[PDB]
Amino acid sequence: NKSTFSLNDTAWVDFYQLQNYTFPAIIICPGGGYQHISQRESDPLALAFLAQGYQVLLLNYTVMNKGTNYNFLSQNLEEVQAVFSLIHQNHKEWQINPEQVFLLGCSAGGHLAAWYGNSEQIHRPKGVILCYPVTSFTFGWPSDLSHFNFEIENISEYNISEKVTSSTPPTFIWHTADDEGVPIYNSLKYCDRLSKHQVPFEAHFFESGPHGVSLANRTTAPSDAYCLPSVHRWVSWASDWLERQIKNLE
Amino acid sequence: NKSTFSLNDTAWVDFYQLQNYTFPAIIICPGGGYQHISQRESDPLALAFLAQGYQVLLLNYTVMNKGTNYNFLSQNLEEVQAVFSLIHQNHKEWQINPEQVFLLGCSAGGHLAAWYGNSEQIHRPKGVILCYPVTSFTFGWPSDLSHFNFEIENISEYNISEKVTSSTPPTFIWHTADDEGVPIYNSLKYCDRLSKHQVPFEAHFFESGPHGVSLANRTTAPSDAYCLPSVHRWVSWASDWLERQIKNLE
Amino acid sequence: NKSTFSLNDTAWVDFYQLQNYTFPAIIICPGGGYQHISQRESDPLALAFLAQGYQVLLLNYTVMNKGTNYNFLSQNLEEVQAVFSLIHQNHKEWQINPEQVFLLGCSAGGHLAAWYGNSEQIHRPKGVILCYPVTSFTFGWPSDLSHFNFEIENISEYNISEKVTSSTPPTFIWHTADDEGVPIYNSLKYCDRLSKHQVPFEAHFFESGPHGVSLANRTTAPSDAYCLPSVHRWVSWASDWLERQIKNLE
Amino acid sequence: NKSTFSLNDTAWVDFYQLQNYTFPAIIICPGGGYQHISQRESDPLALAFLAQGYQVLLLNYTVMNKGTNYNFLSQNLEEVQAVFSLIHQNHKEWQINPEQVFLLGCSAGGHLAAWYGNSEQIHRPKGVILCYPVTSFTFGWPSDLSHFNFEIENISEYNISEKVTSSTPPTFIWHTADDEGVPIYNSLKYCDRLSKHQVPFEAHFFESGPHGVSLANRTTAPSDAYCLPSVHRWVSWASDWLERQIKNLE
Incomplete structure (x- = not known):
């Protein structure tokens, strides 16, 4: 049901798998300003999709939480790439449909996502989702x-x-x-x-809501303000969107 | 159930009313590039809301379809204003809650809406909706x-x-x-x-869809391409939004 | 958009029509214990569907509100039948798809609906809907x-x-x-x-809700108790159901 | 996140827990004709709810899959009971709100649920859900x-x-x-x-669908016929229902 796979010196890659097929997988990129890994954007987020019928590859990409030296911002793209690679070779075992791999990311974790959203090969995500993503270090953030x-x-x-x-x-x-x-x-x-x-x-x-809102469910929210039902609708919109893309494949 | 009310020399104002209260009304501004009045953004649109439980005031604001002289773009704001006025005085008879009047507009009809969305008084809409609106005559349109x-x-x-x-x-x-x-x-x-x-x-x-899509329902669409189920979801989103605002009015 | 058509000595048949095709029509049978015609199950109900993209034929079938003599319970089936007949002959003008005519009814109005739900010909509804219908005069009602x-x-x-x-x-x-x-x-x-x-x-x-709830919307409800959002969901379920049937044709 | 707890000689009780509170938990009773435990009604079902914001207690109640002797149909009620007991005592640690425990069951697994749905104490579920349940061994089944x-x-x-x-x-x-x-x-x-x-x-x-449909999602379905989108709607209806009960509890 779950087992981690070492990637690099500093890059975990949690892989969630279930079994009824070739379920379309989806890699996630939890946010956290490259500093850490917003926990409330990982495991909880994973289940959400895993429940929506998607193999989940939670990527714990290198960040300033393991002795930072150089701008690994480049080393990251590698890490995520390695994920696809992992799939490309273990797509039969993972019960994953290699032609149905998507990329997810939120906040900064999103930035990496959009970033990887170009210049690759048989590691190109048929689609990506970006929850309150970071477009550039020149847009109000950092x-x-x-x-x-x-x-x-x-x-x-x-x-x-x-x-x-x-x-x-x-x-x-x-x-x-x-x-x-x-x-x-x-x-x-x-x-x-x-x-x-x-x-x-x-x-x-959405009208209002603090950063890192995630699922806006009592699953992902520290206080009450971080629990927004109207905002939680995205995870639903996203479900339909994704599948709408799946159908438009062959 | 329905009866028109003459406004100016050139400005119809269709008023749809029903009866079970003080139903929150909503004024609509059908698009049509100030030239005419996109029929597929009127009556059909009206029913939609009238069914969603809203008194409907379809405004047939002056356009280049009745002998155009000067930039009535100013004379319009007046027309719409007259509508509120009409309500402000006939709010008891119209069975309308004066504190619950909203403005709707699409395409160009939207432009007028946002336009009127400032500089007024007891004719200020508690909220407005703009379907593929026109922000300025400097944004790709005209x-x-x-x-x-x-x-x-x-x-x-x-x-x-x-x-x-x-x-x-x-x-x-x-x-x-x-x-x-x-x-x-x-x-x-x-x-x-x-x-x-x-x-x-x-x-x-939404991903794709031609201009003037309206309801995207077989009620508002010339050909098949103008009938989009995914896009039609807006009229539903809008419903929740509006009512979400109503509740936030006590 | 709307015009009535005399049927029998005592039987109105309101016909609602719009225009963008051959929209699937639907006949409605408002309840009212054969005594009268529950208003809150007519016009409002009509719009609902008329908005959901359906030609509406509101049938004002004979009842104990026009000098009752014999059990016209048989004379009714005739009246509704006449409606289909009307369509069968004016299906081109009515812009209605004769192969897409459905029957609706609620409370007692429903009883007639299910009743007509057998023993007919090119007047057979491809499907019917029964809102809190009356199954028999032996089931708690009359x-x-x-x-x-x-x-x-x-x-x-x-x-x-x-x-x-x-x-x-x-x-x-x-x-x-x-x-x-x-x-x-x-x-x-x-x-x-x-x-x-x-x-x-x-x-x-649904868990709770008084008889005649209709749309459970502020459009069809005397007091607050007759306004139930959870129950209102049926008009939406019904929409999907109907259309699911439409597709399930040629 | 997950850890099993031995109950009796033959009765597993998988307990799924997460952490942002006192999340309302819900016990599940997977079907399988008392013979086994329909896998496609367990883990997958668990995640569904666990994602919908509910602590999950999957009960692996004794069945004819571990050397059957006597009609443990009575011994089962005990097993489930033990679950509540477990909560009643570990409700603080489990982060569970003892006043918000519900029972779920499907097919035969449901029969046990309704069964336990009476004659108990501070182990009474504030509500239960029964997916295509078994009402009696006299209703077409066994x-x-x-x-x-x-x-x-x-x-x-x-x-x-x-x-x-x-x-x-x-x-x-x-x-x-x-x-x-x-x-x-x-x-x-x-x-x-x-x-x-x-x-x-x-x-x-629902109109059609084979027994054991479960979530009708590509998560719970052997073939294509076991993957029904329309039917999958229940897990959504159920969500709203449950929460509607939570709110309407205090």
Whole structure:
């Protein structure tokens, strides 16, 4: 039902599997500002989909929580890539349909997602979902000009907004129109710079809700304010969206 | 059940009423590029809401379909205003709760809506909805630089995007991310320039769908492509949104 | 959009029509214990469907409200029949698809519906819906042994439960499990005596709710207790059911 | 997140727990004709709820799969009882709200559920759900007069239909109107003999679908016929129902 698989020196990859087929899997990228891994965006999130009928690959990509040296922002893309690789070779055993692998991410964890959303091969996700994602370190986030800042002059490079082209996979993006950790602009501008390239996508923007809202269910929420029923609707919208994509495969 | 009320020299105002109370009414602004009145955004639209439990005031605001002279773009705001006025005085007879009047508009008909969405009094809509609205005559629409163009140098004035402030009522905006008549940018940029002013709103953006989609139901659609079930979901989202606002009025 | 058509000496037949095709029509049978016509089960109900994309034929079948003599319970079946007849001949003008005509009824109005649900010809409804229907004058209703009682020894004949066979069309039945006007047994036993004949159907039974609940919307409800959001869900279930049947054709 | 707890000589009790509170837990009773434990009604079912925000206690009650001797049909009630007991004492650690414990069961697993649905104490479930349950060994099931038949003359005693009174907790019952393993009559008659006792409940009956349908999702279904989207709606209806009860408890 579950077993972890070591990736690199610092990169866990939890793999959730069940059994009734070739269930379409989906890799998740929990947020946490590259610092850590927002727990309330992992296991809980996993179950959600695992219950919605999806093999889950929760990626614990390297972050500033294991002795940070260089901008592993590049080393990450590798880690996620390694996941697909893992599938590409263990797709028979994993009971996964290699032609039905998607990528998920929220907050910063999203940034990596959109990032990986280009320049790859038989590791390209047929689609991605970005929950209140981070479009660029130039969009209200990182809040502090100098924090997780470990150099690298080229900052415009770490703006996955520009890195969007016609080849970019279909995406689902939602965001609370009051998220103080990261302005909706992130998702907003991203959509604009996503439609102009005739990229099929769906977007949803809720009135209010704090950053890291996740499922907005009593499963993912510290206080009461983090438990929003109206916002929780996304996990449902996303379900329909995904499957709507599956059907449009052959 | 229904009876029209003459407004100005050129401005019909269809008023739909039913009876079980003080049902919250809602004024609609059918699109049609100020040229005419998109029929597939009127009566059908009316019923939708009238069925969802709302008194309907379909406004047939003056357009280039009755001998156009001057930019009545100002004379319109008056017309819609007259509607509220009509309610403000006939709210007891109309069985309408004056404290529960909302404004609806789509495509260009939306532009007027957002426009009226500021600078008024006891004629201020507790909320508005804008279906693939027109934010400004500078956002991909009017397609032709010179068509419905009847002068008036000051063009930036007819951009209801800037005309959005903290006083702007809560709004619901959706748009098909491929509408060729008017780019999603309209609603998109609008949202951005709507959130920054801490204005509570909800947004939805569908993958594909032609302009004037309306209800996306076999009630509002010329061909098959104009009949989209996934898009039709907005009229449902909108219902919940509205009522969510009503409850938030006690 | 609407125009009535005289049927018999005493039998109105309101016909609601709209225009974008050949929209599937649906005849309705408002309840009212054969005494009158529950208004809160007519016009409001009509719009509901008319909005859900269906031509509506509201039948004002003869009742004890126009000088009652004999048990017109037979004369009714005629009236409804006449409706189909009307369609069969004016199906081109009515813009109705003759192969997509359904029957609706609630409370007693339902009894007639199920009744007509057998022994006919090119007037057979491809499906019927029965809102808290009356299965027989022997199922807790009529409450009074002697009221609308105008003789006719053969009472078992007026039990449309037995009158159900394999030929009976697919039906949708819902009922509030506390309806004091008529026990759920009506719909309950009906389902049993509906499944045994391998008749495809769908049923729903809500916890609580008074008789005549109709849409349970602020459109159909005298007091607050008659406004139930959870119950209102049926009009939505019914929508999907119907259309699920439409698709289940050519 | 998960750990089993031995109950009796032959009775596993899988306990699924998560952590953000006092989440309302729910015990499940997987079906399998008392012979075994329908796998497709356990773990998958658990996740569903565990994702819907519920602590899950999957009960692996004794069955003819571990050397059957006597009609443990009585020994079962004990096993389930022990579960509540376990909670009643470990409700603080389990992070469970003892005043919010519900019972679930399907097919035969349901029979036990309804059964336990009376004659107990601080182990009474505030509500129960029964997916295509078994009302009595006299309702089309057991199919064979002599199979799991291990004596016990008193057969009418094993009919949990009669065992329903005003004290019986609110229940949610659904059933496919074509289930060949067990006729809908089970749930049908049960509803009748459930309403007459003014017991608040909700029912749903789908047109078609084989026995053991479970979630009707690609998570619980051997072939394609066992994957029904329309039927899968129950797990959603159930969610709302349950929570509707939580709110309406305090």
